[PDB]
Amino acid sequence: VLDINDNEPVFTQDVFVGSVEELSAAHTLVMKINATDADEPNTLNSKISYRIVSLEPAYPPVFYLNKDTGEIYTTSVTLDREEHSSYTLTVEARDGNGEVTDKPVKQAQVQIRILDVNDNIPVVENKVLEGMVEENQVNVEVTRIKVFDADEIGSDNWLANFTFASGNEGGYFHIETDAQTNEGIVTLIKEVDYEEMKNLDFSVIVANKAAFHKSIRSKYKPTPIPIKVKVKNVKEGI
Amino acid sequence: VLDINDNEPVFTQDVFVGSVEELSAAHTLVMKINATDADEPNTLNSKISYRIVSLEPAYPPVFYLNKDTGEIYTTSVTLDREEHSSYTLTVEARDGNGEVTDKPVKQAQVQIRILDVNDNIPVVENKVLEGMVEENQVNVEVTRIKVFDADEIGSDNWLANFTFASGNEGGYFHIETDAQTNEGIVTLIKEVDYEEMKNLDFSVIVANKAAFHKSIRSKYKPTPIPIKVKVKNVKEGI
Amino acid sequence: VLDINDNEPVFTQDVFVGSVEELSAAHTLVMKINATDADEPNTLNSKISYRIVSLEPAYPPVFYLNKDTGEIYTTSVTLDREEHSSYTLTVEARDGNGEVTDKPVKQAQVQIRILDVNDNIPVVENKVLEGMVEENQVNVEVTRIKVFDADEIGSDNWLANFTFASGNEGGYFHIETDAQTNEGIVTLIKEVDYEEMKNLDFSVIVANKAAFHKSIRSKYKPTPIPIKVKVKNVKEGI
Amino acid sequence: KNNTLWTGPKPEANCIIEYGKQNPDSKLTLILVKNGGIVNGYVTLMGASDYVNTLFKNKNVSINVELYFDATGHILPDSSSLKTDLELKYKQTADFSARGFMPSTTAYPFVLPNAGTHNENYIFGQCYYKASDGALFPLEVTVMLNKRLPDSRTSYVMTFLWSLNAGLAPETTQATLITSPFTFSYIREDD
Amino acid sequence: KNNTLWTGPKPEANCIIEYGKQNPDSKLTLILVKNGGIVNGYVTLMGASDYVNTLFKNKNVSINVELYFDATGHILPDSSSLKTDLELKYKQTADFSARGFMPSTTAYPFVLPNAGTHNENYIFGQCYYKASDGALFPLEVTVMLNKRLPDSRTSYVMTFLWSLNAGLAPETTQATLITSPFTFSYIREDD
Amino acid sequence: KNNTLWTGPKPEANCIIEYGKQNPDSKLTLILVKNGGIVNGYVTLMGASDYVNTLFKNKNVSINVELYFDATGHILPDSSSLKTDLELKYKQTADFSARGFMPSTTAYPFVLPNAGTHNENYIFGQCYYKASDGALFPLEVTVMLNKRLPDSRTSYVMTFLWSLNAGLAPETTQATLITSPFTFSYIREDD
Ligand SMILES: [Ca+2]
Ligand SMILES: [Ca+2]
Ligand SMILES: [Ca+2]
Ligand SMILES: [Ca+2]
Ligand SMILES: [Ca+2]
Ligand SMILES: [Ca+2]
Ligand SMILES: [Ca+2]
Ligand SMILES: [Ca+2]
Ligand SMILES: [Ca+2]
Ligand SMILES: [Ca+2]
Ligand SMILES: [Ca+2]
Ligand SMILES: [Ca+2]
Ligand SMILES: [Ca+2]
Numbered sequence A, B, C: 001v002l003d004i005n006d007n008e009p010v011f012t013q014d015v016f017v018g019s020v021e022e023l024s025a026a027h028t029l030v031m032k033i034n035a036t037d038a039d040e041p042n043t044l045n046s047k048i049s050y051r052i053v054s055l056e057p058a059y060p061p062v063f064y065l066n067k068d069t070g071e072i073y074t075t076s077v078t079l080d081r082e083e084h085s086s087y088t089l090t091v092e093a094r095d096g097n098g099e100v101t102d103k104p105v106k107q108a109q110v111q112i113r114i115l116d117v118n119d120n121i122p123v124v125e126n127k128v129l130e131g132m133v134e135e136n137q138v139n140v141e142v143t144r145i146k147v148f149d150a151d152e153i154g155s156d157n158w159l160a161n162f163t164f165a166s167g168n169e170g171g172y173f174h175i176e177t178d179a180q181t182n183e184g185i186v187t188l189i190k191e192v193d194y195e196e197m198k199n200l201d202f203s204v205i206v207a208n209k210a211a212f213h214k215s216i217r218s219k220y221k222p223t224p225i226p227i228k229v230k231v232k233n234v235k236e237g238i
Numbered sequence D, E, F: 001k002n003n004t005l006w007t008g009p010k011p012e013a014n015c016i017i018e019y020g021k022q023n024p025d026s027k028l029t030l031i032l033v034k035n036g037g038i039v040n041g042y043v044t045l046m047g048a049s050d051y052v053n054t055l056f057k058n059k060n061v062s063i064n065v066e067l068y069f070d071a072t073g074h075i076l077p078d079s080s081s082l083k084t085d086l087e088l089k090y091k092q093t094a095d096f097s098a099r100g101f102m103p104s105t106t107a108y109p110f111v112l113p114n115a116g117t118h119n120e121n122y123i124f125g126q127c128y129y130k131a132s133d134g135a136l137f138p139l140e141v142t143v144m145l146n147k148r149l150p151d152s153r154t155s156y157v158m159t160f161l162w163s164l165n166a167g168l169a170p171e172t173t174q175a176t177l178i179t180s181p182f183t184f185s186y187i188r189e190d191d
């Protein structure tokens, strides 16, 4: 019985899913799509040619689809999660010589999720940096240090983290990160006397809960951020 | 009839004007001054020697005046418009061997205007970065982002320019530059419900309307500026 | 009379004091400790071996004590005064072959003070940068520019210093550093008319009273800091 | 003296940068000169395809060139980015042995395909890209010598990586990619 | 072997930096050594005038040196910054042909005096200036090979540019300008 | 040809970095090759002690190597960091004279032990440290030629300084210190 090309190549799945890390080296294998052709093996009737129909956000191209193997690799163009987090991609499988024609052939979709790495340094937005406390107070909010981070919200790559550089050797302040607003919450843990006129100014260093990516270290110089604190006087009597 | 040196060299103009761009390469021709001597040609009685009498702001020297040709060039010292915008210069033309004497000789003035290039990155002065809107409001001022630029005031090299980096995918904000105060004017274009508690924080990138000079690119890393926005509750009833 | 090792090495002082500058080259001689042994000279009974018992803050090690000479040098690890200002160190002198045993031997202390250098650039903390004056006022506080500096508090390496970059050609402002709070105090030295609507915005450059250390120059680009100034209207009548 | 091994001084397209590409899209200039116990190298790449010549429309770029050599120092073209062998500045009986131009396997051995090990097999440096508007951008260069075998037919490895990590893309249009000359030196194998 | 062409190791003032200046105000040390198909170069400039030695009282400086050579590789002193020819480390019958030391016109051709074209004719790098207070400042170096003819009598061009773009001037007083040695390599012309 | 003077290509521990240390704690690879009137150099250091291999647990590091040579270019091991003489790539009658490999005392003279003078005796450059997490840190390199005599028995001096001044330490654990290869060239003494 002589063969004829009477059935098209069909994908093993209507949707494929893979993941690749940000800043991946060129030609890094992301995933692989597959299809099958029931016609006579090792004949053009069964030679599949995998092609990319459309892509999102289309430009620029960071994925190359080996038409013979179906393997997807990363290009010489670097992936940046902060530029594009997820790629959704429509593929195609063709019969014969793999020539693109006006014929409607079977197509599936691919969804690549780009993995986030800590490659963005935190930054204080807090435009007015000055603490405020009253005399003879304890356990009060001195200030809230609002910090922005480009990396994946919620992750340890985004979560702000703090350390006193200088000024808290007296143990008058405690700092902790509010994971919901990403604010550094500093509070008084000691009463202060306005008349003694102690200088409670202090400096702090910002970073991420998780270490910074090797791509950005050394480019990051820990610069202490100064915070002045003003004290309120109160009528105390004799 | 034998010649005598009985008339001085006189300039074709009481004032010369030229212009040269900032950061110009060394020996770049700015302009040329001229004078004439009516005495016997190609004799010392007609050999003119152009010299610089005084200069403003005098130091440092960034102009060399070829005494034989009158051509003015730029020196190995770089021109910076932000250092000095306009140079006013008094020149001199001498007879004979070009020897500087106590004799009062004719002198003119030169005015060189230094052309501005975009070689200065914008910077937000806005010391307290936080937006403010009420519930159920529309078309209101969220905040004004005050930005400073060293380049020529009014020019596209100075005019601030903005783009949302992240946080405005919902289309709740619109930004435009106020060309008179150079403020980024962000406003609400959508009502917000305080009780739904949507986070309307967002980030923005600053630049110049005109591209940056090749002297400064790559030295400029677009860093998104975070802006927190707080919402006011209002008694609404049932 | 045959010698016996019947007296221990004793230090010339219960406490030694020296000083070395920050960022010192490796093997730089800081100081030298000494001891004496009354036993027979040039015999093991009189060979002293100087050793470091304990150190503060112990880690990392930046001092090597030559056991034979008592000389103290700086290691290949750099000294940073902002990391540790003063080192207090307990030394030891041993008899014989210089073998560390459970025997209680004489010990003294060394105190090294690390000298501060200007290797830290000033930074404005002042989170809300905007001046405020009324119409028809003179000799009033426009704003206070709060600045932080890591270097030795009080020193010219820490003392803030200011220069107008642009905007004060009219001579409307005067700036001086408050050496106690390290604030740049700018004040009005000229009346302003609200109705004339002059723009009094200006820019300023921050530095240290003393020059910056050669370790940090060129890494410091003087960037003018913009300061907007708002004016208050007052009912003046006809 | 049998002391210069190169691509020639102004080669035609001889190298493939783009993935899956079957024909050359770039011109690699590579010169290896013996000097005592070291080789002095010189390398520059010029784009020769629209793909290569629009890479600098992005602010983060990576260009990889891999050279795999056999036991007598000749290029293995199937696996290498460079599709034409190098040649001596002076001509061939048997073509020739170029083993003395190769990176020493004593100084730069082949090792376990374990991640992040043996960083003594890399040379790091910088060269530049001059943009069409004139802005000069630094390109970080990594040269890997030996270290990782790509297959069982290779004796020597030399790979080049040029990286750009700019705040703003150099170009907004197609422009001839040209890496400014990068020089490097390495300990060489015996002849 | 006829393989080193230079100024000598510690030349007297031989180069003019300042404009309109008629006599040397600086000492250029330049050494060009053949190595196979490349020349290895070494260059350093030392100031020898108050003008040159106060240039680093400014934060933005530019020092240009231009060398124009005839068809046999000898300096044309009228137009060049260097006022004395280079010499072989070994002495002269006819003085000599130094064409094999020149930058290749194949690798680095002469082209249209059009702006911003042919950036393959430049080598970029860095060297340093150590200030009197000890601060070390980077100097960006540009070497141009051939590219632009200055007139109809020149066969080869080699120009050097040292640029400083500091936040604060290195000096506040006169100090001997010294550029730290800069090495570079280029493809050479045939002998 | 009597043209390569070196440590060998993969030396055993031959150099002392740590103070007061009596035995080698590091492996210095140094190659000096003659090329016309210059020497081309190549240098890399590898740690071989826990002290050396934990230096990059700090963000500010300084590694000094000092080489002092006698009048015929041989190492004086008592005072030098390198405890074994250099050798010719080809073997010894009298061991040999290595004076032609030394830095010229004309180009780089010995001078007054006055601070901050004669910065023409330094070469500045950069090489790199690749951390265990992969981050690549620049190391500023200073090479001093002659300039300061250390005693009355030395004829030539060559010292190396590698400096790290990072915002954050490269390492948090012990790791093999490896400086990536640094190349340099200098004017050489006569043979
Ligand atoms: Ca079929
Ligand atoms: Ca990223
Ligand atoms: Ca990321
Ligand atoms: Ca982060
Ligand atoms: Ca009180
Ligand atoms: Ca009170
Ligand atoms: Ca006349
Ligand atoms: Ca400018
Ligand atoms: Ca300008
Ligand atoms: Ca601008
Ligand atoms: Ca509501
Ligand atoms: Ca409500
Ligand atoms: Ca005793």
Ligand SMILES: [Ca+2]
Residues within 6 Å of the ligand: C022, C080, C081, C082, C119
């Ligand atoms: Ca310090």
Ligand SMILES: [Ca+2]
Residues within 6 Å of the ligand: C022, C081, C082, C115, C116, C117, C118, C119, C151, C152
């Ligand atoms: Ca200090």
Ligand SMILES: [Ca+2]
Residues within 6 Å of the ligand: C118, C119, C120, C121, C122, C149, C150, C151, C156, C157, C158, C159, C208
């Ligand atoms: Ca300071």
Ligand SMILES: [Ca+2]
Residues within 6 Å of the ligand: C135, C193, C194, C195, C196, C236
């Ligand atoms: Ca009024």
Ligand SMILES: [Ca+2]
Residues within 6 Å of the ligand: C135, C194, C233, C234, C235, C236
């Ligand atoms: Ca009024």
